[PDB]
Amino acid sequence: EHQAIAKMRTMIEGFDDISHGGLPIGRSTLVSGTSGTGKTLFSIQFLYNGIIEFDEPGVFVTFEETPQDIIKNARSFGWDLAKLVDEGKLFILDASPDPEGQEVVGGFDLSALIERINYAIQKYRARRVSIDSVTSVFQQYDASSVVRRELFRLVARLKQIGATTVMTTERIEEYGPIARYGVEEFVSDNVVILRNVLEGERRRRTLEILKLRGTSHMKGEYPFTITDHGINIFPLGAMRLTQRSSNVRVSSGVVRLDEMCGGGFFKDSIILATGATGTGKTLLVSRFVENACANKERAILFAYEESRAQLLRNAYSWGMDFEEMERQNLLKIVCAYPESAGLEDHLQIIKSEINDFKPARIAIDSLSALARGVSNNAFRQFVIGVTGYAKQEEITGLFTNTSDQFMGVHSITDSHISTITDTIILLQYVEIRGEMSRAINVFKMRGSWHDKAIREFMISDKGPDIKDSFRNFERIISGSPTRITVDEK
Amino acid sequence: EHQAIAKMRTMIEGFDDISHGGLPIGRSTLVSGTSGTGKTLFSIQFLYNGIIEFDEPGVFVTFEETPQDIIKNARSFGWDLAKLVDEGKLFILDASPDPEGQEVVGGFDLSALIERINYAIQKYRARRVSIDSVTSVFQQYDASSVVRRELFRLVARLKQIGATTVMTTERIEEYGPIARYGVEEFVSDNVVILRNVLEGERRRRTLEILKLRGTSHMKGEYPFTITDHGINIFPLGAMRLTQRSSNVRVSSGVVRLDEMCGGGFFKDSIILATGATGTGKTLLVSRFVENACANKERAILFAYEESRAQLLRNAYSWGMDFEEMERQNLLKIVCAYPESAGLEDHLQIIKSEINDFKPARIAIDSLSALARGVSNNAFRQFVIGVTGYAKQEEITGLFTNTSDQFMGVHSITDSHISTITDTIILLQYVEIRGEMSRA
Amino acid sequence: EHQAIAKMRTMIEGFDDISHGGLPIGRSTLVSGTSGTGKTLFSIQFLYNGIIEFDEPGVFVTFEETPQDIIKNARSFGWDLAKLVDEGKLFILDASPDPEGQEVVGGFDLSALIERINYAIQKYRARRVSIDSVTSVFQQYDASSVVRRELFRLVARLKQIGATTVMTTERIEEYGPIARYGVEEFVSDNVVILRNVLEGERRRRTLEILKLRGTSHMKGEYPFTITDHGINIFPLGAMRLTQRSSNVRVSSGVVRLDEMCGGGFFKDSIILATGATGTGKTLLVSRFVENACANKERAILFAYEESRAQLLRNAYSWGMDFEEMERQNLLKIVCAYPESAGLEDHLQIIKSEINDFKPARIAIDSLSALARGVSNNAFRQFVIGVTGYAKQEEITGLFTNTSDQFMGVHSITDSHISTITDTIILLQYVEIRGEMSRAINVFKMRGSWHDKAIREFMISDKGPDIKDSFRNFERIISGSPTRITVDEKSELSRIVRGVQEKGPES
Amino acid sequence: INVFKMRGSWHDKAIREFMISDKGPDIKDSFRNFERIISGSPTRITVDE
Numbered sequence A: 001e002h003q004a005i006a007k008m009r010t011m012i013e014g015f016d017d018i019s020h021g022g023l024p025i026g027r028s029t030l031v032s033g034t035s036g037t038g039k040t041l042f043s044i045q046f047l048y049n050g051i052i053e054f055d056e057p058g059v060f061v062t063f064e065e066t067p068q069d070i071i072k073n074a075r076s077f078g079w080d081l082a083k084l085v086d087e088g089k090l091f092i093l094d095a096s097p098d099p100e101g102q103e104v105v106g107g108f109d110l111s112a113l114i115e116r117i118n119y120a121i122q123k124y125r126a127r128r129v130s131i132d133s134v135t136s137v138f139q140q141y142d143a144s145s146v147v148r149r150e151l152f153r154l155v156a157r158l159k160q161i162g163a164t165t166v167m168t169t170e171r172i173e174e175y176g177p178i179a180r181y182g183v184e185e186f187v188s189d190n191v192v193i194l195r196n197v198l199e200g201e202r203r204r205r206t207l208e209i210l211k212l213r214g215t216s217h218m219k220g221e222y223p224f225t226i227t228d229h230g231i232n233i234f235p236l237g238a239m240r241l242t243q244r245s246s247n248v249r250v251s252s253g254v255v256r257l258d259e260m261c262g263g264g265f266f267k268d269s270i271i272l273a274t275g276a277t278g279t280g281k282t283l284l285v286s287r288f289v290e291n292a293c294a295n296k297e298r299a300i301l302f303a304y305e306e307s308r309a310q311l312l313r314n315a316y317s318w319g320m321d322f323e324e325m326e327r328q329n330l331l332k333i334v335c336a337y338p339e340s341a342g343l344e345d346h347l348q349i350i351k352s353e354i355n356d357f358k359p360a361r362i363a364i365d366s367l368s369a370l371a372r373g374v375s376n377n378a379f380r381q382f383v384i385g386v387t388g389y390a391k392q393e394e395i396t397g398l399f400t401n402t403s404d405q406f407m408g409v410h411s412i413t414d415s416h417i418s419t420i421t422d423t424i425i426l427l428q429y430v431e432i433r434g435e436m437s438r439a440i441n442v443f444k445m446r447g448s449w450h451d452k453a454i455r456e457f458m459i460s461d462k463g464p465d466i467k468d469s470f471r472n473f474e475r476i477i478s479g480s481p482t483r484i485t486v487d488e489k
Numbered sequence B: 001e002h003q004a005i006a007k008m009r010t011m012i013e014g015f016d017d018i019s020h021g022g023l024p025i026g027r028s029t030l031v032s033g034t035s036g037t038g039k040t041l042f043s044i045q046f047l048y049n050g051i052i053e054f055d056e057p058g059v060f061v062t063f064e065e066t067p068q069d070i071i072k073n074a075r076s077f078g079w080d081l082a083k084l085v086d087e088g089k090l091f092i093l094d095a096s097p098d099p100e101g102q103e104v105v106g107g108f109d110l111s112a113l114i115e116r117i118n119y120a121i122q123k124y125r126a127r128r129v130s131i132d133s134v135t136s137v138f139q140q141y142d143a144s145s146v147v148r149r150e151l152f153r154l155v156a157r158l159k160q161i162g163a164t165t166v167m168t169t170e171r172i173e174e175y176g177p178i179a180r181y182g183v184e185e186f187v188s189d190n191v192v193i194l195r196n197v198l199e200g201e202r203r204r205r206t207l208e209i210l211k212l213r214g215t216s217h218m219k220g221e222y223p224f225t226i227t228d229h230g231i232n233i234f235p236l237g238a239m240r241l242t243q244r245s246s247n248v249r250v251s252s253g254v255v256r257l258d259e260m261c262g263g264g265f266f267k268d269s270i271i272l273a274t275g276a277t278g279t280g281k282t283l284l285v286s287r288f289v290e291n292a293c294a295n296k297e298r299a300i301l302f303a304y305e306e307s308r309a310q311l312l313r314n315a316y317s318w319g320m321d322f323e324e325m326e327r328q329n330l331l332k333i334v335c336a337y338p339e340s341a342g343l344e345d346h347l348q349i350i351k352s353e354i355n356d357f358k359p360a361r362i363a364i365d366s367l368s369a370l371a372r373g374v375s376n377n378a379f380r381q382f383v384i385g386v387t388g389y390a391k392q393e394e395i396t397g398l399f400t401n402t403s404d405q406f407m408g409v410h411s412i413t414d415s416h417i418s419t420i421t422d423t424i425i426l427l428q429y430v431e432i433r434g435e436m437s438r439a
Numbered sequence C: 001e002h003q004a005i006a007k008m009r010t011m012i013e014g015f016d017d018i019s020h021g022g023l024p025i026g027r028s029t030l031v032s033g034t035s036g037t038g039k040t041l042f043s044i045q046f047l048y049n050g051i052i053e054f055d056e057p058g059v060f061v062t063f064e065e066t067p068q069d070i071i072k073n074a075r076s077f078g079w080d081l082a083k084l085v086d087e088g089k090l091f092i093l094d095a096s097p098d099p100e101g102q103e104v105v106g107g108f109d110l111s112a113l114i115e116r117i118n119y120a121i122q123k124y125r126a127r128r129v130s131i132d133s134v135t136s137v138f139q140q141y142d143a144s145s146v147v148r149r150e151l152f153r154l155v156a157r158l159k160q161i162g163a164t165t166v167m168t169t170e171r172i173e174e175y176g177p178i179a180r181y182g183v184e185e186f187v188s189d190n191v192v193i194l195r196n197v198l199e200g201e202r203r204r205r206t207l208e209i210l211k212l213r214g215t216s217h218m219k220g221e222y223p224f225t226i227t228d229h230g231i232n233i234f235p236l237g238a239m240r241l242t243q244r245s246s247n248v249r250v251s252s253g254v255v256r257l258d259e260m261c262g263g264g265f266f267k268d269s270i271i272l273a274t275g276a277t278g279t280g281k282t283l284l285v286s287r288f289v290e291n292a293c294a295n296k297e298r299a300i301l302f303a304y305e306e307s308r309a310q311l312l313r314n315a316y317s318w319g320m321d322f323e324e325m326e327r328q329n330l331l332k333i334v335c336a337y338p339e340s341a342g343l344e345d346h347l348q349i350i351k352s353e354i355n356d357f358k359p360a361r362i363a364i365d366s367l368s369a370l371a372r373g374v375s376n377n378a379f380r381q382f383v384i385g386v387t388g389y390a391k392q393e394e395i396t397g398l399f400t401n402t403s404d405q406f407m408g409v410h411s412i413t414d415s416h417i418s419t420i421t422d423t424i425i426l427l428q429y430v431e432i433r434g435e436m437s438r439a440i441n442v443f444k445m446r447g448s449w450h451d452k453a454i455r456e457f458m459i460s461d462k463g464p465d466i467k468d469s470f471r472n473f474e475r476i477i478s479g480s481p482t483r484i485t486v487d488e489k490s491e492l493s494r495i496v497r498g499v500q501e502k503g504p505e506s
Numbered sequence D: 001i002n003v004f005k006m007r008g009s010w011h012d013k014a015i016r017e018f019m020i021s022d023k024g025p026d027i028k029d030s031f032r033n034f035e036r037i038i039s040g041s042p043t044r045i046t047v048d049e
């Protein structure tokens, strides 16, 4: 073999994209992380995916967890390990000590274990082997200096066999040493780090590939999620800038708005409805949703502000009946607090809900509600995730944002999302004669002509009614206009 | 000789500029860094470049990675070491232990290793040696004081042979000790630190020369990128302020704009199109791109906001046909998210895309898109890289920035790039009679 | 001098000011620092300067570097140690271990080293000793308690001999302990700390004198630079406020501006040109540089924004020919990125270029370009350096600053430099009838009267033309004024109908 | 006093002044002849003939 490094696909969702193909074949891959990061899972899912997708038998070496529990715990993700053992596709090599025993057994077992490991490889014709918690065997009476030789023996032997290995290491500090003894990092050909970062009393699971000897990869951390389908990574940097874009138009739910946008929203576009509290962003959202059900198309409303009941109330008061929308299976509501999870989880819940309802339109009520507490950089990453996903899925997306300050209108978005979105719908309060009047304005459309006027609009039982602009007024954007009055030419 | 210290060129892109000539001849250089920094490559690339560029034979001493893998991993960059081994230009000295190890090697083995090296040096008439992972050999049962003498023995003996060496050392912290035992720094004549700094969930690789005993060098960290062409360093502080300038004018695509600029943009100038969102910077950029193809000149549009298709849609709706420009091979669109890489990588992608297309014009849509999350200093440093490169490459550059606040701009670029910009085109909204008109 | 301890001059640029006279004679000074800080150089340059300037023989004790390398490495600074060794003025004491050595030696050798040094001192009649990397000798198997007794033995004996010694020690952390074993700091009479502080991916070298038993010294860190001339320190706090000041006036290149300054800029003064980008600060600088060469005086233009060629282009577009100025050897352009080095380095390059050209005028385009990324406190320190240096050298200096916000900027300078400068030139944009017109104003001048009017100015091929002020206007400084009209039709030049031509033939 | 928003109701859009006395809070009339009331320091009209 006088070619480059051939990789084996792990079929772990997102991992093969960061690893540019997957783990290098015939080499050892070190997966380190703190307690509860998902190290044991990553090893299990590695062998399972190789069996079910490629018929490549696997050997699982455990040093602490009993084989009974390993199968037991795996049933969470709905995969029977006991079946693959019966089929001889998987062999859980019990290397865990018994409650009784003796000491002064340093590298005595290590030599014996290699023969036990190589045994299962030749016999089961194994191509993949995952060794869980290799550290736990040195946790007898050893130093860094001693661990290095025992590890290099195992790694070198496994490379000779021609088997692709995954090794699990346990950590104490999230950003300290990659491995316990500060040695494992340099013994392994490849380094993978599982992190469970705290910050803000929340948790964010991240995966990083520190190195893969002989190849390239994506540098940096990438957020993943442990679900009922195992590890799920979102390479939000791997998503390419090649989204489909057409000139197909769609109604906004408001006919006058469709005229103001030069014929309606683009089907392949992202719409932003920004305004102060009480302006009526949720109204446009509701209106935008009904129009999808008028053409008998599916759409999803992601609410993070109001409950499921209160949404029905405010909508019915606007005439539109959301009760019928759910019965006809054309509209699906979710409703969940932003504090209920992390942005990595919400991004998945959205993506998951989309594939199970194949929407043609989507409306997330308040992005600003999701930016609550979360850093701007982590939030901006969430936007690109949802935006790009719906963009390449031909789904028209309407997003809601509440500007922190009303009147004066300093910048559309405080978190600066106005450069990511395609169409900007601006709502604002206008102080006219002691009254808080509203004003709608299509701030921009990348492909359409759109109206330039700042038109007022009232709200009633019928819904939004757009009226005339403030032609005879000055400083309208400021929120506190000034009628100059034409005296008179 | 009775003069200054002679250096040996490494031919590594950027390094020889930083080391002011290359690695000093007859001395060992310590290249330390955490896991995945590119030490092994730096050692390999040091020997390879010596053979291919100077016909200087090399000896590679490995202490952990098996010799088969060294050649195997090298194939990624597209260079066959096995041929160099067969030609006797390169000798891979396997010093790695056997899977059936034994005990006590800290006296006869150091002499043995030197003997094997010296024999290898004399046999192949070698001029360069790279010893990979010297830390691994002390990892048996040694202390800092014991490591100091073993290194001092290793360095000095090699110094007598007259061999210019590169030594690889591993760390634990990125900004902690330079080496593992906190001793290797003062034993070596020259120190080089490879850093893989995290920050913001991204990784930035930097190169620093701590000291070159007897000579000068560039001080500080310098960002490098490991690609399919090996380590590529960008000494952004080395490039000189000697950019070429002429009175030649070029069209903007907008005839009336060319009148507003006194006859059009200069060819050797940096144009800045700033304004709030919706003002129409992409429009001016597109119109700037089309005019390049109208005069049958090549140009590159670096887009980081809109997709390739949406760019086509909006352009065609503006009349101009981007599709025809791609067929005639005068216009090339890249399109990539800012979060797809780091600024050290984006700078390279730009530079790489330029040399493969030799453009006459260049437009990067939304610099503010790249300024997402990244610190101000790292962004300004990235600007200098792209700005200075296009100026010296005779390429007219139009850049785009979206001011965070509409109406009340108060500042061209709030990131303050305009100070390094020659021509500024400003766009803004103006409230006229209840209507949003541009200016 | 009013100090209890007699000191010995190191002749290192700046150190004798920080140590208030040099190193105390008969005592030991500990110079410690991390790797590559310049420890060995300081000890080498300490012996060299003693030989060249005072014919004081020196003994160099090396514990790791080979004697041939000491001589080899010193040639970089243009120092022929091989000659000095041959002349018996310098003796390199090799105490370095063996590539084929045993183990265990750090006790009787310490007593033997005493007998070696005392032999070298007596034979060579040495007055200066440098023991480089004394730490490496305890780097065999020793602890802090063992170090204290062995150092004290070495130091005390050297003090008895009457030798002024410099001891080099290595560190791990830049701001942590002073030395490795945390013991050397209290055994020595004097402690000098060399630092290679990182911060912002750049490297800034500082020298600090922690203590001098028996005397005073300049407290705190002071930036130094290693060049082809060795260590160069900038005691930016030792620079006294005693510069010469005259009433002499010089032209600014712009005649109308000279009127606005009551007779032109002062010779011994600092000029600050402020304004938003595009106003024309670079223009005034060019005119300030041309007028010096037009009167046959030398001047240097320090540019940090534009290239050397673009400066030539834009100047020629303003008429003035910079090419001829370089030919006549009256004008010198530097041009360098602020990111190309640190403030300590830039400050030296500027100081160096001045001494190599002896200008009568100096001009630094965009100080705000040097304030990029650098903390305000470090930038201010740089400004004081250049400003103070130019002031005591009778060099007229014109500085440029670009306000980050245009039209309505509430301050002259964001870094608050307006109190260090003597004369402030203000440029700004004025929104008049949908047009961006410029305006110039002499904000302050220390010794003169100067014009108080905010006159607008146009820029053409001929250069800057100063016209009249916006008398019939309010809120000028705001950038977008409000037109009130009490007159404007009032005289000046009435008489309607026919009062002009355009035109004929010539 | 001003009801800035109500999710399920119509609510007054007027910024009406309100007095406080021994009897409690009493809401009165709006500042119709005033601009920039939200600013805090409004500008009157003319109250001419």
Ligand SMILES: Nc1ncnc2c1ncn2[C@@H]1O[C@H](COP(=O)(O)OP(=O)(O)OP(=O)(O)O)[C@@H](O)[C@H]1O
Residues within 6 Å of the ligand: A033, A034, A035, A036, A037, A038, A039, A040, A041, A042, A076, A077, A133, A226, A227, A228
């Ligand atoms: N069905 C599931 N849904 C969601 N999360 C799950 C599910 N099953 C397991 N997990 C998560 O996986 C984590 C455990 O992962 P696993 O035990 O495979 O690796 P690990 O915890 O890193 O190994 P170790 O226990 O040795 O540290 C638990 O903290 C749990 O939160």
Ligand SMILES: Nc1ncnc2c1ncn2[C@@H]1O[C@H](COP(=O)(O)OP(=O)(O)OP(=O)(O)O)[C@@H](O)[C@H]1O
Residues within 6 Å of the ligand: A276, A277, A278, A279, A280, A281, A282, A283, A284, A305, A314, A317, A318, A402, A459, A460, A461, D004, D005, D006, D007, D008, D009, D010, D011
């Ligand atoms: N039945 C109704 N009749 C008249 N106006 C109504 C009615 N219901 C709601 N409104 C108006 O709508 C405004 C609320 O807007 P909406 O409920 O569309 O969401 P929103 O204001 O964007 O949400 P939030 O302010 O909670 O972020 C209120 O200020 C109110 O004036």
Ligand SMILES: Nc1ncnc2c1ncn2[C@@H]1O[C@H](COP(=O)(O)OP(=O)(O)OP(=O)(O)O)[C@@H](O)[C@H]1O
Residues within 6 Å of the ligand: A185, A186, A210, A211, A212, A213, A214, A215, A216, A217, B033, B034, B035, B036, B037, B038, B039, B040, B041, B042, B076, B077, B133, B226, B227, B228, B229
């Ligand atoms: N073809 C390639 N393209 C891009 N990057 C590569 C390529 N090959 C290797 N790399 C990068 O180089 C890094 C490995 O560097 P190298 O193995 O030379 O030294 P090191 O990792 O510092 O040493 P060690 O592996 O002993 O810790 C990998 O993390 C990988 O990201």
Ligand SMILES: Nc1ncnc2c1ncn2[C@@H]1O[C@H](COP(=O)(O)OP(=O)(O)OP(=O)(O)O)[C@@H](O)[C@H]1O
Residues within 6 Å of the ligand: A418, A419, A443, A444, A445, A446, A447, A448, A449, A450, B276, B277, B278, B279, B280, B281, B282, B283, B284, B305, B314, B317, B318, B402
């Ligand atoms: N077909 C069209 N007809 C009229 N106006 C258009 C058309 N397409 C786009 N526009 C105008 O151009 C503006 C968008 O400008 P452009 O597409 O050049 O990018 P930009 O606004 O500079 O950047 P960003 O896309 O980040 O907002 C919109 O506000 C819109 O008013």
Ligand SMILES: Nc1ncnc2c1ncn2[C@@H]1O[C@H](COP(=O)(O)OP(=O)(O)OP(=O)(O)O)[C@@H](O)[C@H]1O
Residues within 6 Å of the ligand: B186, B210, B211, B212, B213, B214, B215, B216, B217, C033, C034, C035, C036, C037, C038, C039, C040, C041, C042, C076, C077, C133, C226, C227, C228
């Ligand atoms: N001609 C020169 N110009 C600029 N810098 C130089 C020159 N010669 C040497 N240097 C600098 O001097 C530094 C080394 O200083 P020196 O060896 O004197 O002390 P040190 O490195 O602290 O000692 P040690 O190596 O024992 O720690 C190098 O980092 C190098 O950059």
Ligand SMILES: Nc1ncnc2c1ncn2[C@@H]1O[C@H](COP(=O)(O)OP(=O)(O)OP(=O)(O)O)[C@@H](O)[C@H]1O
Residues within 6 Å of the ligand: B419, B421, B422, C276, C277, C278, C279, C280, C281, C282, C283, C284, C305, C317, C318, C402, C459, C460, C461
């Ligand atoms: N040949 C010329 N004719 C007319 N006006 C000119 C000419 N050259 C420059 N200008 C005017 O001068 C202004 C630029 O000023 P200058 O370059 O002197 O300093 P500056 O703008 O402060 O520098 P910076 O570009 O760093 O802001 C431009 O706005 C331009 O209108």
Ligand SMILES: [Mg+2]
Residues within 6 Å of the ligand: A281, A282, A305, A365, A366
């Ligand atoms: Mg709402």
Ligand SMILES: [Mg+2]
Residues within 6 Å of the ligand: A445, A446, A447, B278, B282
């Ligand atoms: Mg657009």
Ligand SMILES: [Mg+2]
Residues within 6 Å of the ligand: B282, B305, B306
């Ligand atoms: Mg655009």
Ligand SMILES: [Mg+2]
Residues within 6 Å of the ligand: C281, C282, C305, C306, C365, C366
């Ligand atoms: Mg300038």
